[PDB]
Amino acid sequence: MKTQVAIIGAGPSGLLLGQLLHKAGIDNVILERQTPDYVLGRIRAGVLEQGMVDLLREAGVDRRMARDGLVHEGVEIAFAGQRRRIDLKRLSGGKTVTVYGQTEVTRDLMEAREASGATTVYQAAEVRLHDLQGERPYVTFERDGERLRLDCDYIAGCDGFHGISRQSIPAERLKVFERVYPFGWLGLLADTPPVSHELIYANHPRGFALCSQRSATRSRYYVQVPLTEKVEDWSDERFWTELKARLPAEVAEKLVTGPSLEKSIAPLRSFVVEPMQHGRLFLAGDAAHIVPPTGAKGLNLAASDVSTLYRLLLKAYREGRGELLERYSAICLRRIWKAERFSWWMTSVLHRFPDTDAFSQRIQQTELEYYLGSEAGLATIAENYVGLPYE
Amino acid sequence: MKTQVAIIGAGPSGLLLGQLLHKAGIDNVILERQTPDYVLGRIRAGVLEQGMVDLLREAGVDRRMARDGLVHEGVEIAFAGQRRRIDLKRLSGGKTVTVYGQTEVTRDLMEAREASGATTVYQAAEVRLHDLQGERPYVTFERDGERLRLDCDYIAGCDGFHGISRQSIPAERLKVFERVYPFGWLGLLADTPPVSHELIYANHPRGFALCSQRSATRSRYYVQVPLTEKVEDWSDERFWTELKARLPAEVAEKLVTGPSLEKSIAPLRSFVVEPMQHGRLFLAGDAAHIVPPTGAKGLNLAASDVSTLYRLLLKAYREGRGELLERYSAICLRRIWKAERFSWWMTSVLHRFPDTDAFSQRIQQTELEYYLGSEAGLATIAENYVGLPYE
Ligand SMILES: Cc1cc2nc3c(=O)[nH]c(=O)nc-3n(C[C@H](O)[C@H](O)[C@H](O)COP(=O)(O)OP(=O)(O)OC[C@H]3O[C@@H](n4cnc5c(N)ncnc54)[C@H](O)[C@@H]3O)c2cc1C
Ligand SMILES: Cc1cc2nc3c(=O)[nH]c(=O)nc-3n(C[C@H](O)[C@H](O)[C@H](O)COP(=O)(O)OP(=O)(O)OC[C@H]3O[C@@H](n4cnc5c(N)ncnc54)[C@H](O)[C@@H]3O)c2cc1C
């Protein structure tokens, strides 16, 4: 087989790129290692920047989101007794965020693709990239037990952190920057009414807690836990009890608990690779960078990369300007680092770090007090939170 | 002898408190360990917040400053090639800073005090504090070889970091927060025209550099150096060469070098003591806290404490409300921590730290890029720089 752009991975990155391209006439083929069900079983993200909301509209996949997603005009930070609300709409100059599960975005994109009849190969084993620097690179894989070959002009590596894409670029061409946090998040999905109409990020002496939702009858909650904890050690009871212990007494007494639908521990990490490309291979999403979940930038950075790629690929294809693809990394990395800086800040002010002397404790508390008390400070939170402009 | 308020130390803190009090009718006595010349030989600070500028006016000691001080409406940060100017006046909502040597402030205050005939004892040895919790505390010292006793109601410990005041409070009553930086500043005073009409703070791969002035024909420059360096290792030549190496090529080629008047290495440190008082002893200035020189807060925090003390002492004395002095620490510590947070930030973004992996390098560079590029960010720099409001 042969296509124009070969897409490795059917997560949000891959599908969104696949949909935008297909809609513009550029044929693509998506190769996915797993089964659709397995993909749709991932809970992950729930917060979308406005820029991605419009990208979805542009991908023609927004009916359901426009109906079921929730627009939020403010978020709440709770520290040392108090609860401060950041009015995102006025502080950002009219911008907001939309709460809509990542699983849903995926579901919607998967519906759109199946209906378009565009090619998608799930359960594509042993994917290998070949001739990344020739005029005709190719992808090989196994379906059942046959080794097939796919010829294409370009390859978009949207296969995530553990994908094959990043490993296919010679180590000596890539420079890596990485930070691992000494903690992880233990998340919990439940079919219960959320505790607040807006999200609550809480800094507490026992660690960070987060109160989120997926809908009016579905809540997503998280608590900071040591990397040494195994999820089977945390029964529902323990989770609710621990959560309640970290929240404002008034919030805690309004909490409607219940049995979990999903529960898991996601470790925190920062990771950026430079550059994000090699010959005819371009990296997008988690295949190129990882951010701690604290500032909700992961899914959102995926979207921005994909937006930049789709638009450089249009010009190269319809306008015959293939030289523009050389600046892909330059464009993406600017946004990536800004997002990384914000995610790192959010993470350092809300989480309780192990082995912290008194001075840094006081500085963390004061960072909160200053930023949440100054008009200029609240603005740095708001404009970053809703998402900095696409360039 | 007997007075009302006994002041330990004749640095800026002590003199300013002494002048404000004396002007209000409250008699004070200042005890200084050294000679006037020795005090006036210290170069230290050169940047004053507006709030202190007015305090000086209120102390009736502003003629010379109003004439020789310089009002600055902007400062410049130089990093990775570029030079960005922060317009302080518009970003802070009309506020500015005044450049005027600390040695001058001292000189002016020392003139004012000698003329008022108010008591001042230089070369006061072996100062000891007694009865800090009684209704009548007292100070003892030696002048020549006689052990004198001074009776007072209150004692203001304005004797700096190595003073006797802080050591006179039982260790178990004070909680300390401290951070020591793995570097120091090697400053240099010269009788040469400054390189810019505004200050230039520079982040460079060899370390931080700072371009300041005292007047139109007198410059003060600094370069970051390891704590292991001794000032006699740095000849003038080496300083100028090293400075020029860390500045923007266009700035460096405009530099008018010359022989030094003064040269010294000041180590960086953060330090806060809680609370700042004990019985009838109240700590002010460096006797209570230390900040890295990066954000120019030292002399400025001294002034704010002294302002709070003078005003609580008025009420207690003339208005008979001695209970108000119990809240002295609460009032001062709020400002102190905010100032400490800003000085720490300034220090972490402009200095090159030893043993920093690639990720933190990129975050330091991006912290600069974001703050110096966002309107909300420049504002957090400006409002903090000019000085947050006195409460
Ligand atoms: C475990 C985990 C937890 C997360 N949790 C959060 C969270 O709590 N909140 C939040 O805001 N963000 C979270 N994120 C980030 C967010 O979900 C991601 O940023 C987003 O999924 C990235 O989209 P993507 O398409 O780049 O990668 P992915 O969603 O990882 O999609 C990559 C796809 O690649 C396919 N694939 C992988 N390797 C191969 C291969 N060699 N061959 C073919 N196909 C391959 C995979 O099966 C997967 O379908 C999480 C990410 C991870 C990995
Ligand atoms: C070495 C040094 C370098 C500094 N450099 C900078 C700089 O480069 N830039 C900047 O912005 N800020 C700098 N500062 C900070 C700024 O100068 C101080 O914040 C300011 O001097 C503090 O005023 P003060 O009156 O509290 O203390 P000081 O100026 O230290 O005055 C305290 C006085 O106490 C007297 N004294 C001490 N112990 C006794 C005792 N037991 N008995 C009686 N009298 C006593 C001392 O002789 C001194 O006169 C520096 C401070 C220090 C200590």
Ligand SMILES: Nc1ccc(C(=O)O)c(O)c1
């Ligand atoms: N920072 C955030 C905010 C919300 C969620 C969420 O899952 O709803 C998250 O995973 C991270």
Ligand SMILES: Nc1ccc(C(=O)O)c(O)c1
């Ligand atoms: N941060 C600053 C700014 C100016 C000076 C100065 O001495 O002029 C300083 O010592 C520190």
